[PDB]
């Protein structure tokens, strides 16, 4: 229980470790929200993914795209870590 991820709406794209359900639980337990699908950029704040194929680099251009480590390490540190430190792209 915390509010680390308050004001975060996360969408997880593709395979991740930890897995989707485990990350969703961590997000909800620590104050955030998640989406099952991404119909628009209206509310999502961060995309979580292990890697980006070219087509995904295009689709998620101008999105904050970070590794699942961002969720894990933030929970472990009891503090929201800078998303840039976990960005998949420069």
Q: What is the resolution of this structure in A?
A: 1.8
12 φ, ψ (degrees, to nearest 5):
-100, 120
CA distances from 74 to 24, 30, 45, 64 (A): 14, 10, 16, 16
Q: Top-level CATH class of 1-90? A: alpha beta
Strand-pair partners of 48:
12, 66
Q: At what angle do helices 20-29 and 69-77 cross, to 10 degrees?
A: 40
For 12, the 3-state DSSP assignment is: strand
- The SS3 of residue 47 is strand
Q: Is residue 87 classed as helix, strand or coil in its secondary structure?
A: strand
Distance, CA of 9 to chain centre: 8
Q: Residue ranges of the alpha helices (H) in 1-90?
A: 20-29, 54-59, 69-77
């Amino acid at each position: 229980s915390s509010k680390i991820f308050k004001n975060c709406v996360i969408y997880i794209n593709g395979y991740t470790k930890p897995g989707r359900l485990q990350l969703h639980e961590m997000i909800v337990l620590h104050g955030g929200k998640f989406l099952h699908y991404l119909s628009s950029k209206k509310t999502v704040t961060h995309i979580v993914a292990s890697n980006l194929p070219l087509k995904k680099r295009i689709e998620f251009a101008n999105y904050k795209v970070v590794s699942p480590d961002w969720i894990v390490d933030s929970v472990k540190e009891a503090r929201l870590l800078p998303w840039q430190n976990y960005s998949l792209t420069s």
